[PDB]
């Protein structure tokens, strides 16, 4: 969880040196630890070692692999893992769908990203805030202000206390087209933010009010 790949590797080597067969959960943990630091080869080696010792992969292992590959944009590995899942027969939860969405988003395949989005909407499962966050990010990246603003006004109507991600993505997309009026009108409601402190701090610091040594 903390992305301490070196410590996880040290613990794995220590527990292997004492004739202890590692469990599937421990291997999943070390795999996700290696994937945090973009060390894909070590994560794949650990995943391969899982089968050697008999510790079969679980759904958590596939989720960790999908997230690690999606962060780096390795969508070929994403589709390989999806094929592995489909031939394994494991049901695909929202994690698989949104991991695929963000993998295609980071890989730049916007059209295939929205194709997978509508494929997910067709079958089942309710998209969480993460799925709409991913679709908003992929829309903002591919120079689409209209879809971004539509999704922004649709999602904020659910009284969900919109997160930092949506505000930063909106600021980015508005700065793409030099929509200084939109940036200012978002900042006016962003500055106060009576509910949370993180939004207030980031909104004050982006404008330059916190650049001082005592204010940083």
């Amino acid at each position: 969880k903390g992305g301490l790949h070196e410590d996880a590797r040290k613990i794995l080597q220590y527990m292997t040196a004492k004739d202890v067969v590692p469990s599937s959960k421990a291997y999943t943990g070390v795999i996700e630890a290696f994937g945090q630091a973009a060390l894909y080869e070590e994560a794949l080696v650990a995943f391969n070692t899982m089968h050697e010792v008999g510790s079969n992969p679980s759904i958590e292992t596939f989720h960790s692999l999908l997230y690690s590959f999606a962060r780096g944009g390795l969508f070929k590995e994403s589709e390989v893992i999806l094929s592995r899942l489909v031939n394994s027969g494991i049901p695909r939860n929202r994690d698989t769908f949104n991991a695929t969405i963000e993998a295609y988003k980071q890989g730049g395949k916007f059209e295939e990203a929205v194709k997978t989005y509508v494929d997910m909407e067709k079958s089942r499962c309710d998209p969480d805030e993460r799925t709409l966050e991913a679709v908003l990010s992929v829309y903002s990246c591919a120079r689409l202000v209209d879809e971004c603003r539509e999704q922004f006004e649709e999602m904020k109507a659910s009284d969900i206390l919109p997160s930092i991600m949506c505000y930063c993505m909106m600021l980015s997309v508005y700065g793409k087209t030099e929509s200084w009026d939109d940036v200012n009108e978002l900042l006016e409601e962003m500055l106060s933010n009576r509910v949370s402190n993180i939004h207030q701090v980031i909104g004050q610091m982006i404008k330059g009010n916190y650049d001082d040594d005592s204010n940083w």
Binding site: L44, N48, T49, H51, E52, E77, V80
Partner: peptide, 17 residues
């Protein structure tokens, strides 16, 4: 007569591709 003189590595480790 005939009785004389008493008569797995490299697996689960393939290239991921």
């Amino acid at each position: 007569g005939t009785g004389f003189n008493k008569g797995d590595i490299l697996f689960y480790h393939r290239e991921f591709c």
